[PDB]
Structure formats: C-alpha cells, structure tokens
C-alpha cells in the first residue's frame, strides 16, 4: 500500500523563495514512495529538494519551467491506478471541468492531476477522479487575489484512494480527507 505526494506551482524564485515554514516540517524523507509534480517549480534547485523527499519523482513541464526537457504530459501507473499528469495551461479554458474531462478520455486515466490555477480541487466526475494540489508556496496568480498554500498526498491501498489536502490557513495547517475508489 503506497502513498504519493502531489504538488506544483512553487514558482521559485519567480514569485516565492521557498515552501512555507510549517510545510517544510511536514515533508520529510522516508514517508514518501512517490512524487507527482504538476507545476513549474522553475529552478532545478527545487527539483533537487524534491528528489530528497523520495527517489521516484515525476514532473511535467509547466508554462514557466526553465528546463525544456520535461514532458508536456505524462501517464504514471501507481498500483491499481492509472494517473495522468499535465500542468494545466494547455487546458482551455484554464480550469474548466469539461475541458479537463475531455482530456481524461484521451489519456484514459482513472485519476487526473493538474495545476496552473493555484486553487486546490478534489472531486469526482463520471466515475473518474480529478486532483489539483494548488500552489505549495501560495505563489501569486493574477486571477485570484487570495491564494492558499497547499499540497496533497494520497494513499493508495488497492483500487481505493484517500487524498489528504494540506492547506495553510492562518498559522495552523488545516487538513481535509477525501476518498475515491475505482468504479
């Protein structure tokens, strides 16, 4: 039974210099066996930090990442789950559910991870699961004047996922649980 970490849109050092203080205290090596990164962390400096928390890291190219060597989108299988990854800027309109869904068909994935909007989202649609970690650094975004730092780690036992959303509201770190199981 494996747990995966999902984050992105860190935007270091374009808009932020690092992940919030408390969050750093929660992400420590050993616990994570997988990492799916949506966003543009931008600097390779942030790729290394990621490479710390775990060894098997998956990253897709964001609209501001320096290294052009990342995949526009990638499909990674995690146990019984087939998961798609894409940054989001390629989905028009940007955070449109119908457009994300249209994308799900083409990929043929059970779960679809994307970011770009910097707004955490975890919902089910026509027997499929959609997750948007948000911005681990609460990175600025012209469309939304109030961004909330956050990441999300899911736990897969078998054909059943439980995604934990980590938000940074106020000082304390609130949390929320959401479960999804293959149709």
């Amino acid at each position: 039974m494996m747990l995966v970490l999902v984050l992105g849109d860190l935007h270091i050092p374009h808009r932020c210099n690092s992940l919030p203080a408390k969050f750093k205290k929660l992400l420590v090596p050993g616990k994570i066996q997988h990492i799916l990164c949506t966003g543009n962390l931008c600097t390779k400096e942030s790729y290394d930090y990621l490479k710390t928390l775990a060894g098997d890291v998956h990253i897709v190219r964001g609209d501001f990442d320096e290294n052009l060597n990342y995949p526009e989108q990638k499909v990674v299988t995690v146990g019984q789950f087939k998961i798609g990854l894409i940054h989001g800027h390629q989905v028009i309109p940007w955070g449109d559910m119908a457009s994300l869904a249209l994308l799900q068909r083409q990929f043929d994935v059970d779960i679809l991870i994307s970011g770009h909007t910097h707004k955490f989202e975890a919902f089910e649609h026509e027997n499929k699961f959609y997750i948007n970690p948000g911005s681990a650094t609460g990175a600025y975004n012209a469309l939304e004047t109030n961004i909330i730092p956050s990441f999300v780690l899911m736990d897969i036992q078998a054909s059943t996922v439980v995604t934990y959303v980590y938000q940074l509201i106020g000082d304390d770190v609130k949390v929320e649980r959401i479960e999804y199981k293959k149709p």
Binding site: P13, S18, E45, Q90, I92, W94, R105, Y140
Partner: protein, 298 residues
C-alpha cells in the same frame, strides 16, 4: 554561475513585499539598475522575479485603494516599469520568456482595472504577439506559444469589442498558419473557445457565445484534418475535433447539431479500423471508445 544570483533574488523579492508600497517601487528600481549592470547572460534569471514583483506590487497599490488617491497613477508607473524590464530581456536576445512575461502582465492589468488599464493590457498583448511572429520559429515552440496566448486571452474580460475583435482574429490566423497540419488543426479548434467563452465589455460582462463562429472554427479545423495525409494522425485529429464539438454541444450551443456529431463519429468508424496494431493504434481506439461511451452510444 550566470544563475548564482537567483537564490539571492528570491530573498530580495520575498522581503520586498513587507516594506510599504511607496517604498517598494524605489527599491525595485534600484534592484533593477543593480542587476541591470549585471550583464546579458545574467538578467535572464535575475530580472524575471522583479517583473512578478511589479505585478504583485500593482495589486498592493489597489488593495490600498481608498487610502491613496494616486494609486491608479502608481499602477501605471509600475506597469511602465515592467514593460521596460521585459524589453531588457528581448535586447538580450530572449523570446520565450519575454512572451510569457508580457502575457502575465496583460492578465494583471486586466484584473486590476486602474485607469488606462485596458490600453496597457492591449499593449502587453500585442507585444507578446510581436515576439511570437518575429522571434519564435520552431514548430513546437509555436503550438505552445500560441496555445498560451489563446488561453490567456480567453480569461481576459477587460477589452472592448474594438480591441477584442482584432486579438480574436489575430489568434485565428496565427493558428491556421502554424507549420504542421496537425498543430494547425488543434490550434484552430482551440480558438473556438475564444468565440464562445471570450468576454468583451459590450455584453456587459456576458460571454459572446458565438455558436456560429465556433462552428466555422471547428469547420476550418475539419478541412485541415482531411489533408493531414496520414492514417494514424488523420484519425486522431478527427477524434479530437469530435470531442471539441461535444464540448460546445453540451454547453447548449444550438449550432452544434447531433447530426454533425454523427457524421464525424461515422467517418471515424470508417477509418479507425485501418491501422497496424500499435501501442498507439490501440489508444486511439480507447480514446474513440471513451468518447462514444461518454455520449452513451457505448
């Protein structure tokens, strides 16, 4: 080396946001001058954060929006600063980066609405378009760059029809003119969205919902499909244009008749079969099936 001042700028940018607003513009300008004498291979990592600085500071000026009476004037100056900083990167023979930074500026000016914000936003957009024409030649970079321009323009609602119609048409042409037939087709259909969800200040906040124009867009897209001249991609481009039709159908765009969806699904049936068993050929069936399962016809 040429990027060893990045971590450095991170702190700077971070702490900048704590000093008071009128204080920041001055500090941001000297940080510019300072890094400005840095070189040309350096400003690439150094100046961008300052650009986002400007943007965030532009919002800060508004959030102080009744305590100051010249906040709209400060915003105009800070956007003039960003325009400047970005032009610096172009001089240092950069394109991709500056094109995206102009887009961000366009979005920012749209959202803030200080006075003359529309004029500024339009300047930032055409400036982005200029880089697209002139400096971006690679086919791949194009599809990505034009798709980013369309996605950005689609979120903006500040333009008056007098400005929206030009950008709107300009995207369509850019799209139909891409290097390859494949990219040409995907892009042109993506423009569909500009005529449906796009918003001008004339319908008083409402989307134009031009079912008619959305159809012609996907129509031209189809024409592009029939020429792709390749079994595998030809069909694959058909399945995509089909899902796109569906996107508008389900949004209750009267123009998208069920007959049209049928004609396209049919053609796809008469072609999907002639493919060599592949890791791909199989996925194009799954894709088509997913699409048909979505329509409940499977």
């Amino acid at each position: 080396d040429f990027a060893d001042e990045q971590s450095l700028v991170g702190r700077f940018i971070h702490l900048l946001r704590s000093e008071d607003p009128d204080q920041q513009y001055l500090i941001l300008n000297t940080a510019r001058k300072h890094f400005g004498a840095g070189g040309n291979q350096r400003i690439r990592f150094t100046l961008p954060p300052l650009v986002f600085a400007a943007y965030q500071l532009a919002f800060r000026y508004k959030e102080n929006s009744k305590v100051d009476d010249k906040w709209e004037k400060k915003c105009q100056k800070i956007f003039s600063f960003a325009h400047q900083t970005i032009s610096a990167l172009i001089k240092a023979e950069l394109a991709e980066l500056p094109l995206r930074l102009f887009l961000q500026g366009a979005l920012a000016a749209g959202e803030i609405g200080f006075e003359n914000h529309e004029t500024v936003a339009y300047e930032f957009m055409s400036q982005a378009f200029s880089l697209y024409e002139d400096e971006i030649s690679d086919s791949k970079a194009q599809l990505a760059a034009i798709t980013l321009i369309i996605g950005t323009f689609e979120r903006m609602k500040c333009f008056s029809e007098e400005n929206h119609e030009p950008l709107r048409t300009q995207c369509a042409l850019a799209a139909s003119k891409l290097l390859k037939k494949p990219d040409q087709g995907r892009a042109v259909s993506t423009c569909a969205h500009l005529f449906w969800s796009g918003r001008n200040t004339d319908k008083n906040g409402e989307e134009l919902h031009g079912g008619k124009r959305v159809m012609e867009c996907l129509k031209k897209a189809l024409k592009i499909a029939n020429q792709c001249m390749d079994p595998s991609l030809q069909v694959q481009l058909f399945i995509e244009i089909l899902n796109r039709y569906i996107y508008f159908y389900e949004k209750e765009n009267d123009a998208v008749t069920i007959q049209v969806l049928n004609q396209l699904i049919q053609k796809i049936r008469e072609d999907l079969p002639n493919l060599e068993s592949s890791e791909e050929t199989e996925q194009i069936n799954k894709h088509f099936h997913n699409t048909l399962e979505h329509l409940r016809l499977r």
